[PDB]
Design a binder for this molecule. Sequence first.
Ligand SMILES: *Cc1cc(C*)cc(C*)c1
Ligand SMILES: [N]
Lengths: 16, 247
Amino acid sequence: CSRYEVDCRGRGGPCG
Amino acid sequence: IIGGEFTTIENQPWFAAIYRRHRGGSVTYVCGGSLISPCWVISATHCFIDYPKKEDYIVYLGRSRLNSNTQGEMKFEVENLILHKDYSADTLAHHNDIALLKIRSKEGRCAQPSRTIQTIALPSMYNDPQFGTSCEITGFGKEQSTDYLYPEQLKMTVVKLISHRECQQPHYYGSEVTTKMLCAADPQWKTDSCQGDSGGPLVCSLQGRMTLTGIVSWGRGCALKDKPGVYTRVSHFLPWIRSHTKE
Ligand SMILES: *Cc1cc(C*)cc(C*)c1
Ligand SMILES: [N]
């Protein structure tokens, strides 16, 4: 996880 | 998108590809969106809440590839980035997950319709298709939940709307889904939206018009049994959309 994450709060994301 | 098919922007011409510029000048994908009028793209607030400054973002319309330019694409800056002031999440559920982006090219223009760019109609107030209806979703999201890379070509798939009664069953999501959300999934649980597809459209034919029925919002995993995609229910947000897009 970093500033370049795509859709970091999306489904299955680190903060989804 | 899990499953479904590679497509091209001409098949989903309201699809907006939203990117963010980083200090240094590298640009990475953020989320999908939909063109609902010449100057207006709608997406999901969760996509932006970490970095809510309009100057960071770029919007492409008429683009079919993720990290490559395609003919007929047009590039826009974000003149206004409007996040829903009552956005919240729990562990899983996102509430009020809806965002507006006013677009303007460097030449000061809004979108112009072409073979690769078209607006999508909004539904009438509280007007939705009946459950069972087949709808389409599209995006550059992961093709498997476990992948680390994103597809370079746009994908789309078909999913069916699921009744509130069925979606609010305990083995589904229970009371996590509200009247302000829609559930949609594949009967066989093989195709779904995934990380990267957020903010993109759930498009349905409704009163014989292609309509933006939903916005990709949340869900547990991707393409898991009894775990549908959850979509912001657009027809229940017309006053929010209206009160924020006045000319
Ligand atoms: C690394 C990371 C990135 C975002 C956008 C959100 C979280 C929780 C973690
Ligand atoms: N999450």
